[PDB]
Protein backbone atom coordinates (compact mmCIF):
# COMPACT_ATOMS: atom_id res chain seq x y z
CA UNK A 1 0.00 0.00 0.00
CA UNK A 2 2.26 2.81 -1.25
CA UNK A 3 1.28 6.47 -1.01
CA UNK A 4 -1.62 7.26 -3.40
CA UNK A 5 -0.15 10.64 -4.41
CA UNK A 6 3.20 8.99 -5.16
CA UNK A 7 1.58 6.33 -7.35
CA UNK A 8 -0.30 9.13 -9.12
CA UNK A 9 2.79 11.08 -10.12
CA UNK A 10 5.24 8.23 -10.61
CA UNK A 11 4.90 8.69 -14.39
CA UNK A 12 6.51 12.11 -14.02
CA UNK A 13 9.84 10.81 -12.68
CA UNK A 14 12.50 10.18 -15.39
CA UNK A 15 14.08 6.72 -15.12
CA UNK A 16 17.08 6.87 -12.82
CA UNK A 17 17.99 7.13 -9.14
CA UNK A 18 15.21 8.03 -6.68
CA UNK A 19 15.96 8.99 -3.05
CA UNK A 20 13.27 8.42 -0.40
CA UNK A 21 13.62 10.60 2.71
CA UNK A 22 12.74 8.89 5.99
CA UNK A 23 10.72 6.32 4.03
CA UNK A 24 10.96 3.78 6.88
CA UNK A 25 8.43 1.19 5.70
CA UNK A 26 9.69 0.33 2.23
CA UNK A 27 6.29 0.23 0.56
CA UNK A 28 6.98 3.38 -1.51
CA UNK A 29 10.58 2.42 -2.29
CA UNK A 30 9.63 -1.12 -3.39
CA UNK A 31 6.68 0.30 -5.29
CA UNK A 32 8.97 2.60 -7.27
CA UNK A 33 11.63 -0.09 -7.71
CA UNK A 34 8.90 -2.25 -9.26
CA UNK A 35 8.55 0.48 -11.94
CA UNK A 36 12.20 0.26 -12.97
CA UNK A 37 13.80 2.93 -10.74
CA UNK A 38 17.05 2.68 -8.72
CA UNK A 39 15.81 3.59 -5.24
CA UNK A 40 17.70 4.51 -2.10
CA UNK A 41 15.53 4.28 1.02
CA UNK A 42 16.95 6.53 3.74
CA UNK A 43 15.65 6.10 7.28
CA UNK A 44 16.99 6.28 10.83
CA UNK A 45 15.50 3.11 12.35
CA UNK A 46 17.53 0.00 11.54
CA UNK A 47 14.36 -1.93 12.37
CA UNK A 48 12.55 -0.20 9.50
CA UNK A 49 15.38 -0.32 6.98
CA UNK A 50 15.73 -4.01 7.82
CA UNK A 51 12.03 -4.56 7.14
CA UNK A 52 12.39 -2.53 3.93
CA UNK A 53 14.96 -5.02 2.63
CA UNK A 54 12.68 -7.95 3.48
CA UNK A 55 9.74 -6.40 1.64
CA UNK A 56 12.04 -5.90 -1.36
CA UNK A 57 13.08 -9.57 -1.25
CA UNK A 58 9.41 -10.58 -1.24
CA UNK A 59 8.29 -8.09 -3.89
CA UNK A 60 11.18 -9.20 -6.09
CA UNK A 61 12.99 -5.88 -6.33
CA UNK A 62 16.80 -5.68 -6.06
CA UNK A 63 16.47 -2.06 -4.95
CA UNK A 64 16.61 -0.95 -1.32
CA UNK A 65 19.91 0.78 -0.67
CA UNK A 66 19.31 1.56 3.01
CA UNK A 67 20.84 4.49 4.94
CA UNK A 68 21.00 6.45 8.22
CA UNK A 69 19.32 9.57 9.68
CA UNK A 70 18.71 12.94 7.97
CA UNK A 71 20.26 15.35 10.49
CA UNK A 72 23.81 15.18 9.11
CA UNK A 73 22.86 13.85 5.69
CA UNK A 74 23.98 15.28 2.36
CA UNK A 75 23.26 14.27 -1.22
CA UNK A 76 25.55 14.46 -4.21
CA UNK A 77 24.69 17.29 -6.58
CA UNK A 78 23.01 16.44 -9.89
CA UNK A 79 22.70 12.72 -9.19
CA UNK A 80 18.99 12.10 -8.60
CA UNK A 81 16.07 11.91 -11.02
CA UNK A 82 13.73 12.09 -8.03
CA UNK A 83 13.68 12.84 -4.30
CA UNK A 84 10.51 11.93 -2.38
CA UNK A 85 9.33 13.27 0.97
CA UNK A 86 6.12 11.58 2.14
CA UNK A 87 5.06 12.74 5.61
CA UNK A 88 8.68 13.57 6.38
CA UNK A 89 8.17 16.45 8.83
CA UNK A 90 11.15 18.46 10.06
CA UNK A 91 11.73 21.71 11.97
CA UNK A 92 12.21 24.88 9.91
CA UNK A 93 15.88 24.98 10.89
CA UNK A 94 16.42 21.53 9.38
CA UNK A 95 14.43 22.16 6.17
CA UNK A 96 16.55 25.29 5.64
CA UNK A 97 19.58 22.98 5.62
CA UNK A 98 18.16 19.96 3.76
CA UNK A 99 16.05 21.48 0.96
CA UNK A 100 18.97 23.42 -0.57
CA UNK A 101 20.82 20.09 -0.94
CA UNK A 102 17.63 18.53 -2.29
CA UNK A 103 17.35 21.20 -4.96
CA UNK A 104 21.02 20.74 -5.87
CA UNK A 105 20.86 16.94 -5.66
CA UNK A 106 18.28 16.86 -8.45
CA UNK A 107 19.43 16.48 -12.05
CA UNK A 108 17.84 18.83 -14.59
CA UNK A 109 14.37 17.48 -15.34
CA UNK A 110 14.37 15.55 -12.08
CA UNK A 111 11.44 15.88 -9.71
CA UNK A 112 10.77 16.45 -6.03
CA UNK A 113 7.57 15.00 -4.67
CA UNK A 114 6.11 15.87 -1.29
CA UNK A 115 3.04 14.92 0.65
CA UNK A 116 2.51 15.96 4.23
CA UNK A 117 0.16 17.53 6.74
CA UNK A 118 -0.93 21.15 6.30
CA UNK A 119 -0.88 23.54 9.30
CA UNK A 120 -4.66 23.20 9.71
CA UNK A 121 -4.04 19.53 10.55
CA UNK A 122 -3.67 20.71 14.14
CA UNK A 123 -7.45 20.97 14.23
CA UNK A 124 -7.64 17.20 13.61
CA UNK A 125 -6.69 14.22 15.77
CA UNK A 126 -5.67 11.97 12.90
CA UNK A 127 -1.93 12.40 13.31
CA UNK A 128 1.04 14.58 12.52
CA UNK A 129 3.24 16.81 14.72
CA UNK A 130 1.73 19.31 17.18
CA UNK A 131 4.46 21.93 16.64
CA UNK A 132 3.48 24.37 13.90
CA UNK A 133 7.18 24.73 13.09
CA UNK A 134 7.04 21.31 11.40
CA UNK A 135 3.78 22.22 9.63
CA UNK A 136 4.71 25.01 7.15
CA UNK A 137 2.16 26.25 4.62
CA UNK A 138 2.33 25.14 1.00
CA UNK A 139 3.77 28.51 -0.10
CA UNK A 140 6.48 28.42 2.58
CA UNK A 141 7.68 25.01 1.36
CA UNK A 142 7.69 26.29 -2.21
CA UNK A 143 9.87 29.27 -1.21
CA UNK A 144 12.37 26.77 0.19
CA UNK A 145 12.89 25.41 -3.37
CA UNK A 146 12.07 28.61 -5.40
CA UNK A 147 13.72 27.68 -8.67
CA UNK A 148 11.70 24.53 -9.09
CA UNK A 149 8.83 24.38 -11.57
CA UNK A 150 5.78 23.31 -9.57
CA UNK A 151 3.79 20.95 -11.76
CA UNK A 152 1.36 20.29 -8.85
CA UNK A 153 0.67 22.23 -5.65
CA UNK A 154 -2.46 21.22 -3.77
CA UNK A 155 -3.96 22.20 -0.43
CA UNK A 156 -6.44 19.50 0.55
CA UNK A 157 -8.90 19.24 3.39
CA UNK A 158 -11.32 16.40 4.01
CA UNK A 159 -13.65 15.89 7.00
CA UNK A 160 -10.24 13.46 7.91
CA UNK A 161 -7.07 15.51 7.43
CA UNK A 162 -5.45 18.65 6.02
CA UNK A 163 -2.73 17.86 3.50
CA UNK A 164 -0.37 19.57 1.11
CA UNK A 165 0.81 17.91 -2.10
CA UNK A 166 3.69 19.12 -4.24
CA UNK A 167 5.41 17.99 -7.41
CA UNK A 168 8.33 20.26 -8.31
CA UNK A 169 10.51 19.77 -11.37
CA UNK A 170 14.02 21.18 -11.82
CA UNK A 171 14.36 23.21 -15.02
CA UNK A 172 16.38 22.16 -18.07
CA UNK A 173 19.59 23.99 -19.04
TrEMBL record:
<dbReference type="GO" id="GO:0008168">
    <property type="term" value="F:methyltransferase activity"/>
</dbReference>
<dbReference type="InterPro" id="IPR029063">
    <property type="entry name" value="SAM-dependent_MTases_sf"/>
</dbReference>
<dbReference type="InterPro" id="IPR041698">
    <property type="entry name" value="Methyltransf_25"/>
</dbReference>
<dbReference type="Pfam" id="PF13649">
    <property type="entry name" value="Methyltransf_25"/>
</dbReference>
<keyword id="KW-0808">Transferase</keyword>
<feature type="domain" description="Methyltransferase">
    <location>
        <begin position="18"/>
        <end position="110"/>
    </location>
</feature>
<protein>
    <submittedName>
        <fullName>Slr1183 protein</fullName>
    </submittedName>
</protein>
Amino acid sequence: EPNDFLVSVANQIPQGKILCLAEGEGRNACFLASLGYEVTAVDQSSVGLAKAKQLAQEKGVKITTVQSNLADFDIVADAWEGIVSIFCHLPSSLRQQLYPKVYQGLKPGGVFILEGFAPEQLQYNTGGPKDLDLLPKLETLQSELPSLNWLIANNLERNKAALIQLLGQKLEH
